[PDB]
Design an enzyme around this catalytic site. Structure first.
Site, PDB file in Angstrom:
ATOM      1  N   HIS A  32       0.903  -1.436  -0.097  1.00  0.00           N
ATOM      2  CA  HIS A  32       0.231   0.111  -0.261  1.00  0.00           C
ATOM      3  C   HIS A  32       0.740   0.819   0.425  1.00  0.00           C
ATOM      4  O   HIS A  32       1.743   1.575   0.818  1.00  0.00           O
ATOM      5  CB  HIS A  32      -1.183  -0.150   1.129  1.00  0.00           C
ATOM      6  CG  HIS A  32      -1.501  -1.672   1.482  1.00  0.00           C
ATOM      7  ND1 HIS A  32      -1.088  -1.980   2.956  1.00  0.00           N
ATOM      8  CD2 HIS A  32      -2.366  -1.942   0.236  1.00  0.00           C
ATOM      9  CE1 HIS A  32      -1.658  -3.005   2.174  1.00  0.00           C
ATOM     10  NE2 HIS A  32      -2.618  -3.191   1.690  1.00  0.00           N
ATOM     11  N   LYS A  47      -6.098  -0.918  -6.505  1.00  0.00           N
ATOM     12  CA  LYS A  47      -6.330   0.581  -5.483  1.00  0.00           C
ATOM     13  C   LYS A  47      -6.830   1.181  -5.136  1.00  0.00           C
ATOM     14  O   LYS A  47      -8.366   1.297  -6.195  1.00  0.00           O
ATOM     15  CB  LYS A  47      -5.518   1.394  -6.924  1.00  0.00           C
ATOM     16  CG  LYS A  47      -4.489   2.699  -6.273  1.00  0.00           C
ATOM     17  CD  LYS A  47      -4.360   3.264  -7.887  1.00  0.00           C
ATOM     18  CE  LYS A  47      -3.207   4.632  -6.907  1.00  0.00           C
ATOM     19  NZ  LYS A  47      -2.830   4.109  -5.919  1.00  0.00           N
ATOM     20  N   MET A  96       0.240  -6.936 -11.401  1.00  0.00           N
ATOM     21  CA  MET A  96       2.035  -7.332 -12.364  1.00  0.00           C
ATOM     22  C   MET A  96       3.088  -7.910 -11.443  1.00  0.00           C
ATOM     23  O   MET A  96       2.588  -7.539 -10.510  1.00  0.00           O
ATOM     24  CB  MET A  96       2.595  -5.847 -13.101  1.00  0.00           C
ATOM     25  CG  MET A  96       1.556  -4.846 -13.536  1.00  0.00           C
ATOM     26  SD  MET A  96       2.159  -5.894 -14.926  1.00  0.00           S
ATOM     27  CE  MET A  96       1.350  -7.191 -15.312  1.00  0.00           C
ATOM     28  N   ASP A 146       6.720  12.847 -14.673  1.00  0.00           N
ATOM     29  CA  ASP A 146       7.456  11.058 -13.735  1.00  0.00           C
ATOM     30  C   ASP A 146       7.817  10.218 -14.030  1.00  0.00           C
ATOM     31  O   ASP A 146       7.127   9.107 -13.151  1.00  0.00           O
ATOM     32  CB  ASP A 146       5.784  11.379 -12.340  1.00  0.00           C
ATOM     33  CG  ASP A 146       6.336  10.983 -10.733  1.00  0.00           C
ATOM     34  OD1 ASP A 146       7.684  11.233 -10.424  1.00  0.00           O
ATOM     35  OD2 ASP A 146       6.059  10.762 -10.040  1.00  0.00           O
ATOM     36  N   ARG A 150      10.108   4.354  -9.287  1.00  0.00           N
ATOM     37  CA  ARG A 150       9.452   3.716  -8.517  1.00  0.00           C
ATOM     38  C   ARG A 150       7.330   3.240  -9.313  1.00  0.00           C
ATOM     39  O   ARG A 150       7.143   2.923  -9.161  1.00  0.00           O
ATOM     40  CB  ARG A 150       9.236   5.080  -7.209  1.00  0.00           C
ATOM     41  CG  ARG A 150       9.095   6.553  -8.244  1.00  0.00           C
ATOM     42  CD  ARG A 150       8.556   7.767  -7.098  1.00  0.00           C
ATOM     43  NE  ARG A 150       8.655   8.605  -8.071  1.00  0.00           N
ATOM     44  CZ  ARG A 150       9.735   9.811  -8.690  1.00  0.00           C
ATOM     45  NH1 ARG A 150      11.622   8.315  -8.244  1.00  0.00           N
ATOM     46  NH2 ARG A 150       9.421  10.847  -8.973  1.00  0.00           N
ATOM     47  N   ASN A 151       7.630   3.956 -10.800  1.00  0.00           N
ATOM     48  CA  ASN A 151       6.425   4.176 -11.493  1.00  0.00           C
ATOM     49  C   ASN A 151       5.743   3.252 -12.403  1.00  0.00           C
ATOM     50  O   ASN A 151       5.191   3.634 -13.410  1.00  0.00           O
ATOM     51  CB  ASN A 151       5.858   5.532 -11.806  1.00  0.00           C
ATOM     52  CG  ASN A 151       5.931   6.880 -10.813  1.00  0.00           C
ATOM     53  OD1 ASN A 151       5.110   6.452  -9.677  1.00  0.00           O
ATOM     54  ND2 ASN A 151       6.350   7.975 -10.783  1.00  0.00           N
ATOM     55  N   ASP A 167       2.262   4.301 -13.260  1.00  0.00           N
ATOM     56  CA  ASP A 167       1.340   5.281 -12.353  1.00  0.00           C
ATOM     57  C   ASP A 167       1.169   6.745 -13.132  1.00  0.00           C
ATOM     58  O   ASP A 167       2.067   6.902 -13.732  1.00  0.00           O
ATOM     59  CB  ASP A 167       1.906   5.396 -10.933  1.00  0.00           C
ATOM     60  CG  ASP A 167       1.795   6.282 -10.103  1.00  0.00           C
ATOM     61  OD1 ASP A 167       1.662   7.691 -10.029  1.00  0.00           O
ATOM     62  OD2 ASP A 167       0.649   6.135  -9.199  1.00  0.00           O
TER      63      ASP A 167
HETATM   64  C1  LIG Z   1      -1.301   0.963  -7.962  1.00  0.00           C
HETATM   65  C2  LIG Z   1       0.397  -0.643  -8.192  1.00  0.00           C
HETATM   66  O1  LIG Z   1      -0.311  -0.852  -9.270  1.00  0.00           O
HETATM   67  C3  LIG Z   1       0.684  -2.498  -9.106  1.00  0.00           C
HETATM   68  C4  LIG Z   1       1.325  -2.773  -7.977  1.00  0.00           C
HETATM   69  C5  LIG Z   1       1.869  -4.327  -7.964  1.00  0.00           C
HETATM   70  C6  LIG Z   1       1.270  -5.011  -9.336  1.00  0.00           C
HETATM   71  N1  LIG Z   1       0.163  -4.480 -10.077  1.00  0.00           N
HETATM   72  C7  LIG Z   1       0.137  -3.619  -9.899  1.00  0.00           C
HETATM   73  N2  LIG Z   1      -0.729  -3.895 -10.951  1.00  0.00           N
HETATM   74  C8  LIG Z   1       2.890  -4.720  -6.862  1.00  0.00           C
HETATM   75  C9  LIG Z   1       3.264  -3.324  -6.476  1.00  0.00           C
HETATM   76  N3  LIG Z   1       4.775  -4.818  -5.162  1.00  0.00           N
HETATM   77  N4  LIG Z   1       4.199  -5.748  -5.807  1.00  0.00           N
HETATM   78  C10 LIG Z   1       4.337  -6.886  -4.214  1.00  0.00           C
HETATM   79  C11 LIG Z   1       3.358  -6.190  -6.218  1.00  0.00           C
HETATM   80  C12 LIG Z   1       2.657  -7.051  -6.652  1.00  0.00           C
HETATM   81  N5  LIG Z   1       2.057  -8.088  -7.108  1.00  0.00           N
HETATM   82  C13 LIG Z   1       4.540  -1.629  -6.309  1.00  0.00           C
HETATM   83  N6  LIG Z   1       2.919  -1.391  -5.177  1.00  0.00           N
HETATM   84  C14 LIG Z   1       2.527  -1.582  -4.322  1.00  0.00           C
HETATM   85  C15 LIG Z   1       2.463  -0.365  -5.598  1.00  0.00           C
HETATM   86  O2  LIG Z   1       1.471   0.809  -5.203  1.00  0.00           O
HETATM   87  C16 LIG Z   1       2.536   0.270  -7.587  1.00  0.00           C
HETATM   88  C17 LIG Z   1       3.758   0.581  -7.509  1.00  0.00           C
HETATM   89  C18 LIG Z   1       3.955   1.832  -8.698  1.00  0.00           C
HETATM   90  C19 LIG Z   1       3.157   1.538  -9.618  1.00  0.00           C
HETATM   91  F1  LIG Z   1       3.886   2.080 -11.107  1.00  0.00           F
HETATM   92  C20 LIG Z   1       1.885   0.889  -9.741  1.00  0.00           C
HETATM   93  C21 LIG Z   1       1.644   0.500  -8.053  1.00  0.00           C
END
Ligand SMILES: C[C@H]1Oc2cc(cnc2N)-c2c(nn(C)c2C#N)CN(C)C(=O)c2ccc(F)cc21
Length: 292
Positions: A32, A47, A96, A146, A150-151, A167
Site C-alpha cells: 500500500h 488500488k 503485475m 514523472d 518507482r512508477n 502510475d
Molecule cells: C497501483 C500499483 O499497481 C500495482 C502494483 C503491484 C502489482 N500490480 C499493480 N498493478 C505490486 C507492487 N508491489 N508488489 C509486490 C506488487 C505485486 N504483486 C507495487 N505497489 C505496491 C504499488 O502501489 C504500485 C507502485 C508503482 C506503480 F506504478 C503501480 C502500483
C-alpha cells in the site's frame, strides 16, 4: 463529473467500466492509498481510495482511472475497470506480479548466492519496454512528467518479464502539492525552473530512469539533496556512469540530459540506440557488479 480528452476522444467517468463490488475479492496487501491483490477468475491489483480523503482526492483518484483506461499499449498497465458505487472506491489494474521496478532491481541485484540473477540484456529489455511505452505517449501527445523506476511495474520476477508504466498520478495532478515532494532529481532545467513541460521533459527523466536501471536501483545523485541537485544540474553537472555501465548505454543517458530540450533525442531515436546496444556483444557480455 470531470471530462478527459486523449487522442481524438473526450471521455467521462460514466465511460469507466463499473465492476460490481460483489464480484471483487481482496486477497492480500501488496505494499500500500492502499493496494491489494484481488480477484474479479481474473487476477487484479486493487488500488483503493481511503474514505478519509477529501474532495480533491476523490477527483484525482477518478481522473487517474480515466487516464489509464484510455491508453492502449502493451507497455502501459491495463485498467480492468473500477468499482466506484461502493466505498472504499476501487480501481482495478492489470496484476503485475513482479512488483515495482525500483524494488525489483534492489532485491534482484546479483549476489554471491545469485551471481547470475540479472544480466545486462535483462536491463536493456526493461529499458526498451519503458521506452516503447514512452514513445506511445509521445506520439499521442501525452506528457508523463514523472518517469522513474518507482512508477514502473514488471509482469513477473523471472526472465519473461515485461516492464510497463504503472502510475500516472503526476500527469493527473497537473491535469486536475509541495516543493519538497517534486521529483526534482528526474526533472530537466526548464521544467523545474520555468515549469515548462514537453515530450523532451520525459526524455530527460528517461535518462535518469536509465541510470536507476543500470545502477540496479540506486537513488539518483547519491548523497545530494534536491536543492543541491537543482544547482548541480543547472550548472552543467551530470551523474557519472553507474558501476560497470557500458559506454554505449551511458551515452544514451548523457544525450537525454542535454541542457537544451531540442538537443535531446525523441523516443524513436532512444529506442534505436537501445536496440543497437542489445546487438553489441561487448555491451551485453559486460558483467554486472556483484555486491558483497
Ligand atoms: C497501483 C500499483 O499497481 C500495482 C502494483 C503491484 C502489482 N500490480 C499493480 N498493478 C505490486 C507492487 N508491489 N508488489 C509486490 C506488487 C505485486 N504483486 C507495487 N505497489 C505496491 C504499488 O502501489 C504500485 C507502485 C508503482 C506503480 F506504478 C503501480 C502500483
Amino acid at each position: 463529473n470531470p471530462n478527459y480528452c486523449f487522442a481524438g476522444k473526450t471521455s467521462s467517468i460514466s465511460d469507466l467500466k463499473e465492476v460490481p463490488r460483489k464480484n471483487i475479492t481482496l486477497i492480500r496487501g501488496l505494499g500500500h492509498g492502499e493496494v491489494y491483490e484481488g480477484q474479479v477468475p481474473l487476477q487484479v491489483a486493487v488500488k483503493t481510495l481511503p474514505e478519509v480523503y477529501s474532495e480533491q482526492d476523490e477527483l484525482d483518484f477518478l481522473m487517474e482511472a480515466l487516464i489509464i483506461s484510455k491508453f492502449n499499449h502493451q507497455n502501459i498497465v491495463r485498467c480492468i475497470g473500477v468499482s466506484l458505487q461502493s466505498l472504499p472506491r476501487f480501481i482495478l489494474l492489470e496484476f503485475m506480479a513482479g512488483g515495482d521496478l525500483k524494488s525489483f532491481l534492489r532485491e534482484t541485484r546479483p549476489r554471491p548466492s545469485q551471481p547470475s540473477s540479472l544480466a545486462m540484456l535483462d536491463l536493456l529489455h526493461v529499458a526498451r519496454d519503458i521506452a516503447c511505452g514512452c514513445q506511445y505517449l509521445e506520439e499521442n501527445h501525452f506528457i508523463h512528467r514523472d518517469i522513474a523506476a518507482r512508477n514502473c511495474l514488471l509482469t513477473c520476477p523471472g526472465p519473461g518479464r515485461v516492464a510497463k508504466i504503472g502510475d500516472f498520478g503526476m500527469a493527473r495532478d497537473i491535469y486536475r502539492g509541495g516543493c519538497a515532494m517534486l521529483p526534482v532529481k528526474w526533472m530537466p532545467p526548464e521544467a523545474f525552473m520555468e515549469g515548462i513541460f514537453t515530450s523532451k521533459t520525459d526524455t530527460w527523466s528517461f535518462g535518469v530512469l536509465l541510470w536507476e536501471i543500470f545502477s540496479l536501483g540506486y537513488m539518483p545523485y547519491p548523497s545530494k539533496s534536491n536543492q543541491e541537485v537543482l544547482e548541480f544540474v543547472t550548472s552543467g553537472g551530470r551523474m557519472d556512469p553507474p558501476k560497470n555501465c557500458p559506454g554505449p548505454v551511458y551515452r544514451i543517458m548523457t544525450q537525454c540530459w542535454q541542457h537544451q530540450p531540442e538537443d535531446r533525442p525523441n523516443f524513436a531515436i532512444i529506442l534505436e540506440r537501445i536496440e543497437y546496444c542489445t546487438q553489441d556483444p561487448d555491451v551485453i557480455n559486460t558483467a554486472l557488479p556483484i555486491e558483497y
